[PDB]
Short mmCIF file of C-alpha atoms in Angstrom, two decimals:
data_model
loop_
_atom_site.label_atom_id
_atom_site.label_comp_id
_atom_site.label_asym_id
_atom_site.label_seq_id
_atom_site.Cartn_x
_atom_site.Cartn_y
_atom_site.Cartn_z
CA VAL Z 5 -8.75 -17.73 -2.03
CA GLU Z 6 -8.89 -17.06 1.66
CA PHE Z 7 -5.90 -14.75 1.53
CA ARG Z 8 -7.74 -13.09 -1.32
CA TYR Z 9 -10.65 -12.54 1.07
CA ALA Z 10 -8.51 -10.84 3.69
CA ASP Z 11 -7.04 -8.66 0.93
CA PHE Z 12 -10.63 -7.95 -0.01
CA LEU Z 13 -11.54 -6.63 3.43
CA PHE Z 14 -8.21 -4.82 3.69
CA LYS Z 15 -8.49 -3.25 0.26
CA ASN Z 16 -11.81 -2.21 1.87
CA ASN Z 17 -10.46 -1.19 5.26
CA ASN Z 18 -11.85 -3.90 7.62
CA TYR Z 19 -8.69 -3.95 9.66
CA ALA Z 20 -10.02 -5.81 12.69
CA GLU Z 21 -11.71 -8.26 10.33
CA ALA Z 22 -8.80 -8.60 7.95
CA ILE Z 23 -6.79 -9.20 11.12
CA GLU Z 24 -8.96 -12.12 12.21
CA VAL Z 25 -8.38 -14.04 8.96
CA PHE Z 26 -4.69 -13.16 8.73
CA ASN Z 27 -4.29 -14.52 12.29
CA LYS Z 28 -5.73 -17.91 11.38
CA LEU Z 29 -3.83 -17.84 8.10
CA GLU Z 30 -0.60 -17.59 10.13
CA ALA Z 31 -1.74 -20.23 12.66
CA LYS Z 32 -2.20 -22.68 9.78
CA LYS Z 33 1.21 -21.60 8.46
CA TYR Z 34 0.32 -19.94 5.16
CA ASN Z 35 3.70 -19.68 3.37
CA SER Z 36 3.46 -16.04 2.36
CA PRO Z 37 5.04 -12.79 3.56
CA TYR Z 38 2.20 -10.66 2.17
CA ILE Z 39 -0.15 -11.30 5.06
CA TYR Z 40 2.28 -9.52 7.37
CA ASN Z 41 2.70 -6.16 5.64
CA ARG Z 42 -1.09 -5.93 5.36
CA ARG Z 43 -1.76 -6.95 8.95
CA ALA Z 44 0.91 -4.47 9.97
CA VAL Z 45 -1.02 -1.64 8.28
CA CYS Z 46 -4.31 -2.86 9.75
CA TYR Z 47 -2.82 -2.74 13.27
CA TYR Z 48 -1.27 0.65 12.47
CA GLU Z 49 -4.65 2.15 11.47
CA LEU Z 50 -6.13 0.70 14.68
CA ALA Z 51 -3.29 2.41 16.57
CA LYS Z 52 -1.80 -0.84 17.93
CA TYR Z 53 1.77 0.14 17.15
CA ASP Z 54 3.61 -2.63 19.00
CA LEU Z 55 1.62 -5.23 17.07
CA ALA Z 56 2.17 -3.33 13.85
CA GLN Z 57 5.92 -3.09 14.46
CA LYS Z 58 6.24 -6.83 15.01
CA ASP Z 59 4.26 -7.41 11.81
CA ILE Z 60 6.16 -5.06 9.55
CA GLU Z 61 9.39 -6.61 10.83
CA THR Z 62 8.17 -10.16 10.35
CA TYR Z 63 7.26 -9.02 6.86
CA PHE Z 64 10.80 -7.73 6.11
CA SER Z 65 12.44 -10.87 7.50
CA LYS Z 66 10.39 -12.87 4.98
CA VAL Z 67 9.81 -10.71 1.90
CA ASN Z 68 12.00 -10.97 -1.17
CA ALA Z 69 14.07 -7.76 -1.49
CA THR Z 70 13.20 -7.32 -5.17
CA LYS Z 71 9.49 -7.58 -4.37
CA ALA Z 72 9.33 -5.09 -1.49
CA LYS Z 73 7.47 -1.92 -2.46
CA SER Z 74 7.77 1.77 -1.73
CA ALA Z 75 4.66 1.51 0.41
CA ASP Z 76 6.14 -1.10 2.75
CA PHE Z 77 9.08 1.15 3.65
CA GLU Z 78 6.66 4.06 4.08
CA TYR Z 79 4.58 2.19 6.66
CA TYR Z 80 7.72 0.89 8.34
CA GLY Z 81 8.65 4.51 8.96
CA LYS Z 82 5.14 5.56 9.95
CA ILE Z 83 5.18 2.68 12.44
CA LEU Z 84 8.63 3.59 13.77
CA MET Z 85 7.75 7.25 14.13
CA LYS Z 86 4.77 6.21 16.30
CA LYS Z 87 7.11 4.08 18.45
CA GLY Z 88 9.45 7.01 18.94
CA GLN Z 89 12.27 5.75 16.74
CA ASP Z 90 12.61 8.94 14.75
CA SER Z 91 16.00 8.28 13.11
CA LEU Z 92 14.96 4.83 11.91
CA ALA Z 93 11.63 6.15 10.66
CA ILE Z 94 13.42 8.94 8.75
CA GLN Z 95 15.64 6.38 7.03
CA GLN Z 96 12.61 4.32 6.05
CA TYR Z 97 11.00 7.42 4.57
CA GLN Z 98 14.16 7.97 2.58
CA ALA Z 99 14.35 4.34 1.55
CA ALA Z 100 10.78 4.54 0.23
CA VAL Z 101 11.47 7.42 -2.13
CA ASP Z 102 14.67 5.61 -3.20
CA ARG Z 103 12.54 2.61 -4.20
CA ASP Z 104 9.87 4.69 -5.96
CA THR Z 105 11.27 8.07 -6.98
CA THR Z 106 7.82 9.52 -7.69
CA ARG Z 107 6.98 9.34 -3.99
CA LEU Z 108 8.25 12.90 -3.49
CA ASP Z 109 5.77 13.16 -0.63
CA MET Z 110 8.29 11.23 1.54
CA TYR Z 111 10.48 14.31 1.51
CA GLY Z 112 7.41 16.19 2.66
CA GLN Z 113 7.17 13.68 5.51
CA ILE Z 114 10.77 14.22 6.51
CA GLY Z 115 10.44 18.00 6.34
CA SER Z 116 7.27 18.09 8.42
CA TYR Z 117 9.18 16.05 11.00
CA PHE Z 118 11.91 18.62 11.40
CA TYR Z 119 9.34 21.42 11.15
CA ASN Z 120 7.61 20.02 14.22
CA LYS Z 121 11.02 19.82 15.90
CA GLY Z 122 11.92 23.41 15.04
CA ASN Z 123 14.66 22.90 12.50
CA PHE Z 124 13.12 25.01 9.84
CA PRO Z 125 16.14 25.09 7.54
CA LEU Z 126 16.25 21.30 7.38
CA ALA Z 127 12.43 21.12 7.09
CA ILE Z 128 12.45 23.68 4.28
CA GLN Z 129 15.33 21.96 2.48
CA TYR Z 130 13.40 18.70 2.31
CA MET Z 131 10.00 20.25 1.67
CA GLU Z 132 11.57 21.96 -1.37
CA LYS Z 133 12.67 18.54 -2.71
CA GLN Z 134 9.03 18.10 -3.72
CA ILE Z 135 8.96 21.26 -5.83
CA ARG Z 136 9.04 20.62 -9.56
CA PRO Z 137 7.91 23.05 -12.25
CA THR Z 138 4.83 20.83 -12.48
CA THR Z 139 3.84 20.46 -8.80
CA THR Z 140 0.15 20.84 -8.07
CA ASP Z 141 -0.43 19.56 -4.54
CA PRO Z 142 -1.56 22.68 -2.60
CA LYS Z 143 -0.58 21.11 0.72
CA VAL Z 144 3.00 21.00 -0.51
CA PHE Z 145 2.86 24.78 -0.88
CA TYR Z 146 0.81 25.26 2.31
CA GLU Z 147 3.28 23.36 4.51
CA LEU Z 148 6.24 24.93 2.77
CA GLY Z 149 4.87 28.43 3.33
CA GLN Z 150 4.42 27.71 7.01
CA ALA Z 151 8.01 26.51 7.21
CA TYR Z 152 9.17 29.77 5.61
CA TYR Z 153 6.94 31.83 7.92
CA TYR Z 154 8.27 30.31 11.11
CA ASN Z 155 11.75 30.64 9.62
CA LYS Z 156 10.92 34.32 9.42
CA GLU Z 157 11.14 34.39 5.62
CA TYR Z 158 7.76 36.08 5.33
CA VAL Z 159 8.33 37.24 1.80
CA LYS Z 160 8.84 33.62 0.68
CA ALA Z 161 5.98 32.39 2.86
CA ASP Z 162 3.70 34.85 1.03
CA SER Z 163 4.67 33.72 -2.47
CA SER Z 164 4.20 30.13 -1.39
CA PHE Z 165 0.77 31.04 -0.02
CA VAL Z 166 0.00 32.86 -3.27
CA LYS Z 167 0.57 29.44 -4.86
CA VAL Z 168 -1.95 27.75 -2.59
CA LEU Z 169 -4.46 30.34 -3.77
CA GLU Z 170 -3.55 29.92 -7.43
CA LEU Z 171 -4.26 26.19 -7.23
CA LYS Z 172 -7.40 26.50 -5.09
CA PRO Z 173 -8.90 30.01 -5.66
CA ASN Z 174 -10.63 31.72 -2.72
CA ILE Z 175 -9.60 28.99 -0.27
CA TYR Z 176 -9.82 30.73 3.11
CA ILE Z 177 -6.73 29.08 4.49
CA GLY Z 178 -4.69 30.86 1.82
CA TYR Z 179 -6.01 34.30 2.69
CA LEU Z 180 -5.45 33.57 6.39
CA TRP Z 181 -1.76 32.79 5.81
CA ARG Z 182 -1.18 35.54 3.27
CA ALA Z 183 -2.65 37.77 5.94
CA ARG Z 184 -0.28 36.39 8.57
CA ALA Z 185 2.67 36.53 6.21
CA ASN Z 186 1.96 40.20 5.48
CA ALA Z 187 1.28 41.16 9.12
CA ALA Z 188 4.77 39.82 9.85
CA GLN Z 189 6.20 42.25 7.27
CA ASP Z 190 4.30 45.12 8.86
CA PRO Z 191 4.94 44.52 12.65
CA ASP Z 192 3.71 47.93 13.75
CA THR Z 193 0.85 47.91 11.27
CA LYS Z 194 2.09 51.16 9.77
CA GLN Z 195 0.89 50.12 6.29
CA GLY Z 196 -1.95 47.66 6.85
CA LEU Z 197 -0.27 45.08 4.60
CA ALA Z 198 -2.45 42.36 6.07
CA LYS Z 199 -5.66 44.40 5.86
CA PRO Z 200 -6.87 43.26 2.44
CA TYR Z 201 -6.18 39.57 3.10
CA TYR Z 202 -8.09 39.51 6.38
CA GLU Z 203 -10.88 41.42 4.64
CA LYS Z 204 -11.01 38.73 1.96
CA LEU Z 205 -10.82 36.08 4.70
CA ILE Z 206 -13.98 37.51 6.24
CA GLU Z 207 -15.39 37.75 2.71
CA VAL Z 208 -15.15 34.02 2.09
CA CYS Z 209 -15.67 33.20 5.78
CA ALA Z 210 -18.45 35.40 7.17
CA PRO Z 211 -20.99 33.04 5.55
CA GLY Z 212 -20.13 29.83 7.32
CA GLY Z 213 -20.35 31.84 10.56
CA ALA Z 214 -19.41 29.76 13.60
CA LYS Z 215 -17.65 27.23 11.36
CA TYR Z 216 -14.82 29.72 10.91
CA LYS Z 217 -14.97 31.15 14.41
CA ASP Z 218 -11.23 31.38 15.13
CA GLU Z 219 -10.33 32.73 11.67
CA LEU Z 220 -13.10 35.36 11.68
CA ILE Z 221 -12.21 36.47 15.18
CA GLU Z 222 -8.55 36.84 14.18
CA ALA Z 223 -9.53 38.73 11.04
CA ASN Z 224 -11.85 41.08 12.92
CA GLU Z 225 -9.34 41.60 15.72
CA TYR Z 226 -6.72 42.79 13.24
CA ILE Z 227 -9.24 45.10 11.59
CA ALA Z 228 -10.44 46.49 14.94
CA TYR Z 229 -6.84 47.31 15.91
CA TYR Z 230 -6.02 48.64 12.46
CA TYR Z 231 -8.94 51.03 12.80
CA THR Z 232 -8.21 51.99 16.39
CA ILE Z 233 -4.72 52.94 15.26
CA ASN Z 234 -6.30 54.94 12.45
CA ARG Z 235 -8.72 56.47 14.95
CA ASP Z 236 -11.87 55.14 13.26
CA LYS Z 237 -14.06 54.33 16.29
CA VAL Z 238 -17.02 53.67 13.97
CA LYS Z 239 -15.43 50.82 12.02
CA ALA Z 240 -13.34 49.52 14.93
CA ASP Z 241 -16.40 49.11 17.11
CA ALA Z 242 -18.19 47.26 14.32
CA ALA Z 243 -15.32 44.79 14.10
CA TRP Z 244 -15.35 44.46 17.89
CA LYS Z 245 -19.02 43.67 17.48
CA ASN Z 246 -18.57 40.98 14.85
CA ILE Z 247 -16.44 39.14 17.39
CA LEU Z 248 -19.00 39.21 20.23
CA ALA Z 249 -21.67 38.10 17.73
CA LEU Z 250 -19.41 35.03 17.35
CA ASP Z 251 -18.27 34.95 20.98
CA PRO Z 252 -20.38 36.94 23.53
CA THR Z 253 -17.75 36.42 26.24
CA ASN Z 254 -14.68 37.59 24.32
CA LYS Z 255 -12.65 39.75 26.71
CA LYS Z 256 -10.62 41.68 24.09
CA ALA Z 257 -13.72 42.84 22.21
CA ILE Z 258 -15.56 43.66 25.42
CA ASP Z 259 -12.78 45.92 26.71
CA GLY Z 260 -12.25 47.48 23.30
CA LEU Z 261 -15.84 48.72 23.46
CA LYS Z 262 -16.05 50.16 26.98
#
């Protein structure tokens, strides 16, 4: 029953508390491996990674191979990644999707890893392993688009961002990236490809004001330059103004006005 209590707290997130009971449970030799994979996660959420590594390993030296779950391998990898053992963590992420083939998000985990390390082709390859003609997780398309973008495949980053929008209409983050993806295709701003997206970004963002400070400033900056190029002092100054209204000390907008 006691173990069932700890699982109660844990299923409820009381890591430090669940930890207290698991610790006595072990001290009184409870013959069960399932206190270890749970304590491991508790420690992991409390960022005690050395403690969580020892626990997930004690777990695997005691659990019955046919009982182990996809989740256990997942946390083994999350714990290893935190301890700097990247190759081992990557294998554990792979193992987890091998155990539960619906955990396509593991490939997303492996891709993000290489994305943060600059191997966009590898990151993209694995991020695409999640794509099915059913896929609905926006993030999948958001992170994939970013991989494409930094891999300089702006056209594909755009389509992938169009997908984020399709799934979550008017989401600012989608307009921001469509904007960026299009600005990349129009380096010298000869066509204003990004213009409409940044305009929509301000559309859905102006309202939360300071909450979208960085996005609004970026959007207005593009516009202000677009209009300076097109010799429209009137509009360009207005954009330069929207920025100061958000940041009175902004040096770019100050100098663009004097």
